[PDB]
Design a protein around this ligand. Structure first.
Ligand SMILES: [Cl-]
Ligand SMILES: [Cl-]
Ligand SMILES: [Cl-]
Ligand SMILES: [Cl-]
Ligand SMILES: [Cl-]
Ligand SMILES: [Cl-]
Ligand SMILES: [Cl-]
Ligand code: NA
Length: 129
């Protein structure tokens, strides 16, 4: 599924991400835009053989099981395929564990490089939330 901007803002709020760990909804929407372009089915292989999955590009190195990332963990206790669903529940639940891990949203390098410090409220501007 390819979400619209306000459609994703609304879904992230419905699953409790708005202001989760102090990160406003615009931060989450901006991170999704630059990680996946709002596409739930996005996958990208890393140089080290791990893969990033879904709207928030969650990495098999630590968070999900894809069966092909040697020495990896599965800390969200989910198959990485669950992160590709039209329903974002599994991605949100896992993202809440990642952002609690100690470095906040810096875990998402695209958030650090393209969202952190910027006018992230623009991402929810006009949305009926
Ligand atoms: Cl957009
Ligand atoms: Cl915001
Ligand atoms: Cl594996
Ligand atoms: Cl594990
Ligand atoms: Cl699995
Ligand atoms: Cl959803
Ligand atoms: Cl933080
Ligand atoms: Na893994």
């Amino acid at each position: 599924k390819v979400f619209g901007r306000c459609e994703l803002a609304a879904a992230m709020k419905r699953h409790g991400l708005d202001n989760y760990r102090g990160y406003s909804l615009g931060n989450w929407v901006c991170a999704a835009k630059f990680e996946s372009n709002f596409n739930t089915q996005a996958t990208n292989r890393n140089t080290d053989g791990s893969t990033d999955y879904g709207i928030l590009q969650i990495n098999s190195r630590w968070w999900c099981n894809d069966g092909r990332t040697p020495g990896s963990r599965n800390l969200c206790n989910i198959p990485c395929s669950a992160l590709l669903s039209s329903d974002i529940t599994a991605s949100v639940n896992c993202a809440k564990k990642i952002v609690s891990d100690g470095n906040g949203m810096n875990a998402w390098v695209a958030w650090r490089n393209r969202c952190k410090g910027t006018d992230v409220q623009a991402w929810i501007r006009g949305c009926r939330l």
